[PDB]
Amino acid sequence: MNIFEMLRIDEGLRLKIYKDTEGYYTIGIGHLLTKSPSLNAAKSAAELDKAIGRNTNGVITKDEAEKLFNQDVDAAVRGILRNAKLKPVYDSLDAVRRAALINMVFQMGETGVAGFTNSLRMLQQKRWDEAAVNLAKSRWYNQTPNRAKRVITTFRTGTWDAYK
């Protein structure tokens, strides 16, 4: 286990544009297409064709799949490390727990994660049990509680048991 493995687990793989939990166009391994109301599935493939560098008719291949996946995982790191309140816990964290943190950012992004005020303290304070509670107290846990569990368990125990 490690990040890519975790995400590849949480996000799954799908070669044809679909809608995330939010009802957002997503393609591949959690690749987020756009959140604008202006676009439909077909128009969002334009955005795609751009990133992909070719007409895809809203279909990619395992490789392009993997291509953007990488670009995605970076960017979150990129995220974490740009943010004045992320970089601290990240640094505070161990190699596995970081895979937890990042996962979140890959789900809701920079901003939306940093918004986990108390937890981020609590978890930098290295206060696992509490931290893991406060997190379950979220819309997040509410939207995708399954995915939220595994991670929460992750931040709790420190391993990949949850990833079995």
- Resolution, in Å, please? 2.8
145 Cβ partners below 8 Å, 6+ apart? Answer: none
Sheet bearing 18-19, strands edge to edge: 18-19, 25-27, 31-34
22 Cβ partners below 8 Å, 6+ apart? Answer: 35, 143
Q: Which of 10, 11, 22, 161 is catalytic?
A: 11
Q: What does the chain look like in DSSP terms, one character per residue?
A: --HHHHHHHHT---SB-EE-TTS-EEETTTEEEE--TT--HHHHHHHHHHHHTS--TTB--HHHHHHHHHHHHHHHHHHHTT-TTHHHHHHHS-HHHHHHHHHHHHHHHHHHHHT-HHHHHHTTTT-HHHHHHHTTSSHHHHHSHHHHHHHHHHHHHSSSGGG-
85: its two tokens: 């309140």
Inter-helix orientation angle 62-80/41-52, to 10°: 80
Cα separation of 107 and 145, whole Å? Answer: 13
Is 20 tagged catalytic? Answer: yes
Q: Which of 20, 47, 66, 72 is catalytic?
A: 20
- What domains are defined for the chain? 1-164 (1.10.530.40)
Cα separation of 46 and 71, whole Å? Answer: 18
Is 91 tagged catalytic? Answer: no
Binding residues for substrate: 32, 106, 119, 134
Binding residues: 32, 106, 119, 134
Angle, alpha carbons 111-148-129 (nearest 5°): 95
Report the structure determination method. Answer: X-ray
